[PDB]
């Protein structure tokens, strides 16, 4: 329990039981280097809060293995090839609740968060099954052995292995908007529909607006191209005054997701405030620190 406290106090996030059970699974695979037990067969390595379990931390965990498009909800636990910057993370709607599922993102490809089961056994199972369906006879036998052991453990522990579980499908009903990442945003909406209001542009049209800002040819033209964004920020101010905090979280998230440093200032105006109004204060802290140092490479706080 002491080790658990260390892991969870460093991130100020509770970790679900599958996190700890999966460490033990990887310890059975390789007692000497559990974090690397899937490296040879799958190209995956356990990191993040697993670095603490591994003793590699013996310093801001808010930025540790936080890739360029990882929103504060997303906490990296597994990394793959740095050519695509494939990685898996727990996704939490609230810092005070357990992860709602495991998402994957390829940070050199896009900002999309792909849901991959609701626990890390599922996410690794799905990765393995895809790899098995692609490939080398020598690799297959090894993969099939890991698949058997992984599947047996999940069955003993009661963990679903589906990419989209019934639980995940129920969360879809509470998502108020997908955002650019596609993971979805969940905020309280009361019986009077207070809590969220939509943006006045479609996602497609918002991306066009962002494109014209990024491609502006001068400061003068960029200022003019920013007018639709400033207009939406005024709407967000009234939404905040009126307790529809989800609007500013959506606009700020989309601008973060678009990826341009030209949006860092307004994203820093939208997202900390939105998270603080939503009483998700840790996420306000993460996004502030990430916007201040949004690195594309060298995000390992222990290197």
Numbering used by the authors: 35 to 92, 100 to 176, 178 to 345
Cite, word for word, the article reporting this structure:
When DNA damage occurs, PARP1 can sense and attach to DNA chain breaks in milliseconds, which in turn activates its ADP-ribosyl transferase activity for modification of itself or other factors, including histones. The hetero-dimer binding interface was confirmed through extensive mutagenesis, combined with ITC and ADP-ribosylation assays. It has been well established that HPF1 binding to PARP1 restricts hyper-automodification of PARP123,26.
To answer these questions, we determined the crystal structures of mouse and human HPF1, and human HPF1/PARP1 complex at 1.71 Å, 1.57 Å, and 1.98 Å resolution, respectively. We also determined structures of human and mouse HPF1 alone, and observed that the conformation does not change upon binding to PARP1. Notably, analysis of the surface electrostatic potential showed that positively and negatively charged areas are evenly distributed on the surface of HPF1, except for part of helices α9/α10 and the linker loop connecting helices α6 and α7, where the protein surface is predominantly negatively charged. Many solvent-exposed acidic amino acid residues are located in this region, including Asp235, Glu240, Glu243, Asp245, Glu273, Asp283, Glu284, Asp286, and Glu292, while Arg239 is the only basic residue in this region. As is shown in Fig. 4b, the C-terminal half of this long loop is stabilized by two groups of interactions: one is the salt-bridge network including Arg239-Asp286 and Arg239-Glu284, which also acts to position the catalytically important Glu284 side-chain; the other is the hydrophobic interaction between Tyr238 phenyl and Val218 side-chain, as well as hydrogen bonding between Tyr238 hydroxyl and Glu292 carboxyl.
